[PDB]
Amino acid sequence: FLPILASLAAKFGPKLFCLVTKKC
């Protein structure tokens, strides 16, 4: 019902890079 891993990979990918670097 909640496809969290797929959502993280296919929608949070560049967002994850931006939040880790703090600066994109």
CA dist., res. 22 & res. 1, Å (int): 31
CA dist., res. 6 & res. 16, Å (int): 14
**Which residue, chain included where needed, has tokens 């560049």?**
14
Long-range contacts of range 14-21, CB-CB < 8 Å, 24 or more positions apart? none
Contact 6, 12 (CB under 8 A): no
**Which residue, chain included where needed, has tokens 């931006």?**
18
Q: How far is CA 7 from the centre of its chain?
A: 8
Residues ≥6 apart with Cβ < 8 Å to 17: 24
Q: How far is CA 10 from the centre of its chain?
A: 7
For residue 22, give the DSSP letter. Answer: T
